[PDB]
Amino acid sequence: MSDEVVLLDFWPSPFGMRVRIALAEKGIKYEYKEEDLRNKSPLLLQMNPVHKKIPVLIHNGKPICESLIAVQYIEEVWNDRNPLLPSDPYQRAQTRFWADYVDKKIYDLGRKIWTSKGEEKEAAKKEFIEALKLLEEQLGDKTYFGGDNLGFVDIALVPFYTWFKAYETFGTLNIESECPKFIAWAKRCLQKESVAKSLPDQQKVYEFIMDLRKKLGIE
Amino acid sequence: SDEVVLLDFWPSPFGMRVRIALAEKGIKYEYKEEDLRNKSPLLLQMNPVHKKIPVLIHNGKPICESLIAVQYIEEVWNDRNPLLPSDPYQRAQTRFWADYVDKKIYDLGRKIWTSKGEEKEAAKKEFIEALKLLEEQLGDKTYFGGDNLGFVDIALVPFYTWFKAYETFGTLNIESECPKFIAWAKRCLQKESVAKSLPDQQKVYEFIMDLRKKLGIE
Ligand SMILES: N[C@@H](CCC(=O)N[C@@H](CS)C(=O)NCC(=O)O)C(=O)O
Ligand SMILES: N[C@@H](CCC(=O)N[C@@H](CS)C(=O)NCC(=O)O)C(=O)O
């Protein structure tokens, strides 16, 4: 346990939650540090000069930025137990692909859903559900995306669950009707301690988004 | 006796990445040109979710997204010519800067030759900032990879072939702002793996000019 591990994060961030899940799942004890992104710390600005974003994993004093890159780092350094990625190069390529798909789609469509109006919002909604269906489809059978254990794609994707209430309310939308197997999988993930301890409740996230929409618009 | 096929489109920076990576590893492969305005049935089957090139098809199985396909190449032909560092922290950083390229270069690039106002002026600003950031992250080591071509060189140098177009349409001069950058690009172009893979800037400019007019852009 001699290693020093610090996580710069902000509690409702799905990207931060990824790293939270990955550390828990590996059994890595760490110091969590909360950032106020409207007043970023000098430490965060020094550790992430390029993007000035969280999460930032700091390991023995050295920063690793971009959540999924941090998750692969965690995987490659603490690789003695609990593989979060397949060892077959082709299967690994594919879990990289779907994790990447999550990065491309979910947060951005998501943000469009709760910020935009009219057809822009209407289009964001359709794409959002297609994206989830594709993911749902790739899950198919399997307990988790990673097969029998939590994997890279579960880690990448399940934090967004905590944002679903906000999507649904501001989006005028219902994911469980459209993608029942999806919501089932999320719920299975929430039974794993590494996930439950890492994710905030949808309600707290909703309120966060609500305070954030008012500080912007439309309502 | 591996079968290797590359679905690609000649002026694609993303395709060039895979082109360079295969050359570096000495992998013999079949190149296959796609008309992105009439995508083949094969491409639609191999890349159903994004419907884009490049697609690396290895023993019949597809790998989509260029830098993912480069890591695949690296991990499978791991026998020699390492394209990524072996150290986890260094590999993380290499991944970070390749990601940085993916985030910035192509998109600012497109804004530069499509957008109009001080949107264009903004794009031009960010574009040069990005090149600067990459520049100072470059040594001088000979390459981003150190003494050899690495992941970030592969990720980045294809966009060189787009520089003439960026400059002529952006009203811009990269070698002014970033001479160390342009010098590196030129060192890269001396590697034969880079040279076979990249078309000429003129060829690309002409592509973008015909593409630019067949868009509504004046
Ligand atoms: N690509 C990044 C995205 C991280 C991100 O967007 N973090 C947000 C919080 S949800 C942030 O730090 N925004 C900071 C600022 O631009 O306000 C991840 O995978 O690490
Ligand atoms: N993220 C992708 C982007 C690839 C991409 O954008 N390829 C282009 C050519 S420049 C394409 O296929 N565009 C297809 C479109 O016309 O639908 C890469 O790393 O593989």
Of A63, A87, A111, the residue that ends a domain is A87
- In this complex, do A90 and B72 lie within 8 Å of one another by their Cβ atoms? yes
- Tell me phi and psi for residue B158, to 5 degrees: -60, -25
Number of C-beta neighbours around residue B178 at 10 A: 19
- Tell me phi and psi for residue B151, to 5 degrees: -50, -50
Nearest CA in chain A to B74: A89
- Best of B57, B68, B106 to disrupt the A interface (most A CBs within 10 Å) is B68
List, in sequence order, every residue forming a beta bridge with A9; answer none if it has no partner.
Answer: A34
**Could you tell me if B31 lies within 8 Å of chain A, comparing CB atoms?**
no
Q: How far is the CA of B16 from the centre of ligand 2 (A)?
A: 12
Contacts of A152 (CB under 8 A, 6+ apart): A68, A71, A72, A75, A84, A85, A95, A96, A99, A145, A146
Q: What is the DSSP letter of B118?
A: H
Q: Is the CB of A15 under 6 A from ligand 1?
A: yes
Of B39, B63, B86, the residue that ends a domain is B86
**Could you tell me if B200 lies within 8 Å of chain A, comparing CB atoms?**
no
Q: Are residues A78 and A92 in the same domain?
A: no
B71 contacts in chain A (CB < 8 Å): 93, 96
- In this complex, do A69 and B100 lie within 8 Å of one another by their Cβ atoms? no
Q: Are residues A98 and A78 in the same domain?
A: no
The answer to whether the beta carbons of residues A154 and A189 sit under 8 Å apart is yes
The answer to whether the beta carbons of residues B34 and B7 sit under 8 Å apart is yes
Nearest by Cα to B163 from B154, B153, B175, B145: B175
Q: Are residues B126 and B181 in the same domain?
A: yes
Q: Is the CB of B83 under 6 A from ligand 2?
A: no
Q: How far is the CA of A38 from the centre of ligand 1 (A)?
A: 12
Q: Are residues B74 and B94 in the same domain?
A: no
Q: Are residues B125 and B68 in the same domain?
A: no
Q: Say which of A50, A59, A64 has its CB closest to residue B100.
A: A50
Which tokens is A112 given? 């469009």
For B11-37, give the DSSP string. Answer: T-HHHHHHHHHHHHTT---EEEE--TT
Q: Are residues A53 and A119 in the same domain?
A: no
**A-B contacts at Cβ under 8 angstroms:** 52
**Could you tell me if A66 lies within 8 Å of chain B, comparing CB atoms?**
yes
With vertex at residue B140, the alpha carbon angle to CA B137 and CA B145, rounded to the nearest 5 degrees, is: 70
Note down the domain range covering A75. Answer: 1-87
Question: Distance between CA atoms of B86 and A8, rounded to whole angstroms?
Answer: 26
Nearest CA to ligand 1 atom 15: A53
Q: Are residues B66 and B156 in the same domain?
A: no
- A54 known ligand binder: yes
- In this complex, do B91 and A76 lie within 8 Å of one another by their Cβ atoms? yes
List, in sequence order, every residue forming a beta bridge with B166; answer none if it has no partner.
Answer: none
Q: Are residues A68 and A24 in the same domain?
A: yes
CATH number at residue A97: 1.20.1050.10
Q: Are residues A125 and A104 in the same domain?
A: yes
- In this complex, do B89 and A66 lie within 8 Å of one another by their Cβ atoms? no
Number of domains comprising chain B:
2
For B40-100, give the DSSP string. Answer: -HHHHHHSTTT--S-EEEETTEEEESHHHHHHHHHHHTTTS--SS-SSHHHHHHHHHHHHH
Q: Are residues B162 and B73 in the same domain?
A: no
State how far residue A69 is from chain B, nearest Cα, in angstroms.
6
Nearest by Cα to B172 from B163, B182, B162: B163
Q: Are residues A99 and A124 in the same domain?
A: yes
State how far residue B63 is from chain A, nearest Cα, in angstroms.
7
- Best of A58, A71, A96 to disrupt the B interface (most B CBs within 10 Å) is A96
Question: Distance between CA atoms of A103 and A59, rounded to whole angstroms?
Answer: 24
Q: Is the CB of B9 under 6 A from ligand 2?
A: yes
CATH number at residue A29: 3.40.30.10
Q: Are residues B29 and B55 in the same domain?
A: yes
Nearest CA to ligand 2 atom 2: B65
**Could you tell me if B63 lies within 8 Å of chain A, comparing CB atoms?**
yes
Question: Distance between CA atoms of B14 and B102, rounded to whole angstroms?
Answer: 9
> At what resolution in Å was this solved?
2.4
Which tokens is A47 given? 């550790």
Q: How far is the CA of B37 from the centre of ligand 2 (A)?
A: 12
Of B26, B61, B86, the residue that ends a domain is B86
Question: Distance between CA atoms of A63 and A44, rounded to whole angstroms?
Answer: 10
Which tokens is B125 given? 């600003």
- Three-state secondary structure along chain A? CCCCEEEEECCCCHHHHHHHHHHHHHCCCCEEEECCCCCCCHHHHHHCCCCCCCCEEEECCEEEECHHHHHHHHHHHCCCCCCCCCCCHHHHHHHHHHHHHHHHHHHHHHHHHHHCCHHHHHHHHHHHHHHHHHHHHHHCCCCECCECCCCHHHHHHHHHHHHHHHHHHHHCCCHHHHCHHHHHHHHHHCCCHHHHCCCCCHHHHHHHHHHHHHCCCCC
